[PDB]
Each structure stands twice: as C-alpha cells, then as structure tokens.
Amino acid sequence: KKIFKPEELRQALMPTLEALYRQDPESLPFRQPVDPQLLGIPDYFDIVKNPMDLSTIKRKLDTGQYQEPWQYVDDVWLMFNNAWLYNRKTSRVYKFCSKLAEVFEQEIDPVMQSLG
Ligand SMILES: CO[C@H]1CC[C@H](n2c([C@@H]3CCCC(=O)N3c3ccc(F)c(F)c3)nc3cc(-c4c(C)noc4C)ccc32)CC1
C-alpha cells in the first residue's frame, strides 16, 4: 500500500506525459482542445460529452488537481476514449490515438508497480 505525497506524484507522472508529447506526429491532434467550430464538425460535442486533451492534462497536473495516480490516468484514458469514439478506425487520428495509448501503457507501468 503506497500513498504518493503530492510532489513525488508530479515528478512520478510528468515523465509519462512528456512521453506522450514526444510522439511526433502522433501527439499533434491531441496537443490542444478539439475546436468543433474551426474544424466544421458541429456534432462533436453531441458525441463527446467530456473533452480532454494533453494541454488540459498538463495544466491539471501543474495545478495539483490529481491527488492520486488514478485521477491522472482517468483523464489520459478519457482523451483516448473520446478519440476512439468519435473517429473512424481507418483515420489518422484514430491510429495516432492507438499509438499514444501504446506508449502510455508502457510509461505508466512503473507508477503502477509502485502502487501494487
Ligand atoms: C496543430 O494544429 C492542429 C493540428 C491537428 C488538426 N486536426 C486535423 C487536421 C484537419 C485537416 C486534415 C489533417 O490531416 N489534420 C491533421 C493534422 C495533424 C495531424 F497529426 C493529424 F493527425 C491530422 N484533424 C483533427 C482531428 C481532431 C480530433 C480529435 C483529436 N478527436 O476528434 C477529432 C475530430 C483534432 C485535431 C485535428 C487541427 C489543428
């Protein structure tokens, strides 16, 4: 039973977020919030109720909004889940999402090792 102290957590989690950002081009569609007006997809917020993206995860990590690892993981998962939900499996964005989820599953493992 491990309970992370706040700044040990930020230092534990930030490398996993940097690993997502470092995927180029795969992280590019995820670096800023989806703007349905600019992209001419007005149904986006009908399907994606709770948007999430790397810039929002970064800001939340930087402002102590993740008190335990599972809250951070939840938001990362949410940004993947939204992208798989909204996009077709053949699309670049969908395949890029899968690449990032693959990276995340490797990079989050040491933190998970510490918890269990
Ligand atoms: C850096 O400026 C950005 C790059 C990605 C651009 N983009 C693009 C542009 C549109 C024009 C065609 C194209 O190839 N884009 C693009 C550009 C860079 C990419 F890495 C990429 F995978 C796709 N499509 C986006 C889709 C999404 C998306 C997500 C995430 N979930 O549901 C949807 C819909 C998000 C961003 C998309 C928008 C401007």
Residue numbers in the entry: 1082 to 1197
Question: What did the article's authors report about this structure?
Answer:
To understand the structural basis for the observed differential binding affinities of CCS1477 between EP300/CBP and BRD4, we next solved the co-crystal structures of the respective bromodomains with CCS1477. As expected, CCS1477 binds through canonical hydrogen-bonding interactions of its dimethyl isoxazole moiety with a conserved asparagine residue in the acetyl-lysine (Kac) binding site (CBPN1168, EP300N1132, BRD4N140). A major difference, however, between the inhibitor binding pattern in EP300/CBP and BRD4 is the involvement of an arginine side chain (EP300R1137, CBPR1173) that interacts with the difluorophenyl ring of CCS1477 through Pi-cation interactions, while establishing an additional hydrogen-bond with the piperidinone oxygen. In EP300/CBP, an analogous tryptophan residue is not present, and instead the equivalent LPF shelf is less bulky and facilitates interaction with CCS1477. Superposition of CCS1477 as bound in the respective Kac sites reveals an altered binding pose, reflecting the reduced shape complementarity between CCS1477 and BRD4, as compared with EP300/CBP. CCS1477 produced a greater thermal shift with EP300 or CBP, as compared with BRD4. Further analysis of the binding energies by isothermal titration calorimetry (ITC) confirmed significantly stronger interaction of CCS1477 with the bromodomains of CBP and EP300 (Kd = 4.0 and 26 nM, respectively) than with BD1 of BRD4 (Kd = 403 nM). Thus, CCS1477 displays preferential binding to the bromodomains of EP300 and CBP, compared with BRD4. Since recombinant CBP BRD was more robust in biochemical assays and crystallization studies, Kd values were determined for all compound-CBP interactions by MST, and co-crystal structures of the CBP BRD with five of the seven analogues were determined. Thus, the difluorophenyl group is a critical moiety in the CCS1477 pharmacophore that facilitates potent interaction with the bromodomain of EP300/CBP and is required for efficacy in cell line models of G3MB.
Many proteins, including the EP300/CBP histone acetyltransferases (HATs), contain several targetable domains. EP300 and CBP broadly regulate the activity of other proteins through their protein acetyltransferase catalytic activity. These proteins contain several highly homologous domains, including KIX, bromodomains (BRDs) and HAT domains, through which they interact with, dock to, and acetylate target proteins, respectively. EP300/CBP are critical gene-regulatory targets in cancer, with existing high potency inhibitors of either the catalytic HAT domain or protein-binding bromodomain (BRD). Using crystallography, we identify the binding mechanism of the EP300/CBP-specific BRD inhibitor CCS1477 in complex with the EP300, CBP and BRD4 BRDs, and define components of the CCS1477 catalytic binding core that are required for compound activity.
